[PDB]
């Protein structure tokens, strides 16, 4: 059995996507979530949906408590996570209102814990290592692209996210260096989220959706009308995709997550 | 009507440039800013001088209170802030004692709060995303340029500063990396700076003045033997700027500053 | 007369490589040390070991007290630090078991104190720009160098170290781009230590021992097995180089360090 938990970005995380609604607020040595979790099912699957940025949009990516969202959501039971992003783009081909199903990241933050082996927490103890040759899972990457393909939606089969600490947009001196690096997509909340998925044993994926060309006349207003305009695409690829990950078997993928967290971990 | 805040870098922070000078001491919602405030007048222009490091030059720039300092300008009525600072040279062409009059920025910093909306101060509420395409003034830089001209300096029209956490200087590594990354100047103090300006809605311009050529030889005393010998050129070049800048319309520019700041706030 | 700092790293830690041991645990205005100091000798030099995470390494890399380790070295009279690190490696000819005597660094940390200079210690003050050019002690990578090649090990002569802050390893969007800067090998230990020792006016050199290929396959298990095989070679080099480096004369070396250490501190 799976059960979905799905973390919205801004202006895409509606609740009205799930059926037979519950509102559960939740607290974990981490501290509180974003937000109330929000139980529900999309068919017959289980999921947990939760918003990064809190219902009204009150906190900055710098500030967002990431231990405790996927703490949180590992505690209720969730196998998977796909999550959604607003983003920048780096690249002439990804056009804004495009859906980008990223594969790869390059870190740019600086004040944000990544790890729950913080040595200050009894759940998590000694010295973990987690491996990042692969951040997000494959076979979910798989089933987001040939979904949007049956959806006739424009959308990438990979690309390399770079996460700024922000809040501020970056200088074009920046865009362009970022370019130069192999980056295809910029935002401010893929890392550390996408790490500590991965140590606590769970499938992670991203719907990036781009909302403008950075620099390389972005502004919020601008960013903002993109999503409103485009925010039905993330909606329909989530609801089409779920049925299908949970008509799949994953106990060999779960697994060798778990295997890969566990042994990563140094005990004293 | 303008005012016209002023920044002094090491050994570029000389009080004797205004005339009737008074000394006031201030306190703002993010704590004491470097040292008083200095009001005085360059022939009809109000003005205010503040010396990032303190008179006695005892902060180093990971601990400077930039918040302070922007904020403490914008409460006393400031329209434009004009700063000095050392800098190191990446580029053959721009040789010791060189003024650089920067157009864009590379952030290398890491421990430094870099917005006023940090969601826990009452005076700034929400989250804020401001545009770095054009981070400094490009009429006050105009002026700037112009001025250099008339006075015979040495003196680029353009320029990349890449600021570095410090407070150790770059490894060869690092100096040849930041070549290819595109920068042209490197100091640790223009991040963050110039981006609370922009937030203050604040018209902001920089004069760098190249110290050395960084180690693609650079220390202490080399710095402030350059200083020494060049210093008579920001102060003069400021001095000749300023009353160009209070004879000028400012109206719409400060008009258009001051939207992109309230645009950029994201309100519950 | 000199005095040898040994700091072992991750599986490179034996205290039976000193004779006459005697174990001291001391305190310094910056904390504890990381563990107990073990004071020797090898053949007839004075040496201090100490175990970076601590003898059943228990403390990752970010949260390792390097301003206290350094601190307790140089109070305890050593002239030299020579250290042991576990590294990936960024290029083809560096294979796992060989030996990189680096000479230069690239710093990708972001939540660690480089200074002792932060103005709250009475011990160290003023404002303290270091020169980073050439990072490591060059007499004493010579000394290793030329020791490596008389025990027939397989060792380069020099390499540029990109320490991350970690504790998660890199992605493999990140592990190329670090190719493309420059870097040849991968740690997340160097940077503060070499800043550190260069502030402390001590000879700091270190010897890399490759474990993998990064990703461009990297595991814990995999980092453990390949230092478990090669160990000994680390040890017969320290055990070997020691003795030479006692042999020879290092007043002028140490006066120049002394010197730029102390024109490197501002005062009021
Ligand atoms: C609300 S505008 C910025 C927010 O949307 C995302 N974003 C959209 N476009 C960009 C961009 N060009 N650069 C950085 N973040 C962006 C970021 O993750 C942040 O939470
Ligand atoms: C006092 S020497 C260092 C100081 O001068 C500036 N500086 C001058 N030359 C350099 C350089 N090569 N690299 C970094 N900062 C430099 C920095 O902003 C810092 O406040
Ligand atoms: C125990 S595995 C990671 C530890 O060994 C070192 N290390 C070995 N291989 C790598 C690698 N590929 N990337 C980063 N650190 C590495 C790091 O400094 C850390 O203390």
């Known amino acids: 059995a799976v059960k979905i938990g799905i973390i919205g970005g801004t202006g895409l995380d509606d ?8 509102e ?37 990516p710098s500030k967002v408590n990431y231990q405790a969202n996927i703490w949180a959501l590992k505690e ?36 944000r814990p990544q790890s729950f082996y913080d040595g200050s927490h009894s759940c998590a103890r000694g010295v973990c290592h ?45 865009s362009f260096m970022f370019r130069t690096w192999g980056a ?8 550390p989220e996408v790490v500590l998925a991965k140590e606590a044993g769970i499938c992670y994926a991203s719907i990036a959706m781009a909302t403008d060309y950075d620099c390389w006349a972005v502004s919020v207003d601008r960013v903002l009308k993109t999503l409103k305009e485009n925010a039905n695409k993330a909606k329909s690829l989530l609801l089409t995709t779920i049925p299908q990950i949970g008509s799949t078997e994953w106990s060999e993928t779960l697994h060798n997550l778990k295997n890969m967290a566990q042994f990563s971990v140094l005990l004293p």
């Open 76 to 111: 209720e039971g969730c196998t998977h996570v796909i999550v959604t992003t607003a983003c920048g783009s780096l690249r002439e081909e990804i056009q804004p209102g495009d859906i980008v199903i990223i594969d790869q990241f390059i870190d740019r933050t600086t004040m």
């Open 130 to 174: 987690i491996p990042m040759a692969e951040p997000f899972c494959p076979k979910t990457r798989e089933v987001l692209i040939e979904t949007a393909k049956k959806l006739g939606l424009r959308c990438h089969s990979k690309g390399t996210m770079v996460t700024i600490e922000g809040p501020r947009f970056s200088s074009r001196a920046e």
């Open 15 to 22: 609740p009205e996507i799930l059926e037979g609604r519950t």
């Open 24 to 60: 559960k607020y939740v607290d974990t040595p981490f501290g509180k979530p974003s937000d109330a979790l929000i139980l529900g099912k999309i068919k017959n699957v289980d999921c947990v949906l939760l918003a990064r940025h809190g219902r009204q949009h009150t906190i900055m």
């Open 184 to 191: 295809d997509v910029i935002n401010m909340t893929t890392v």
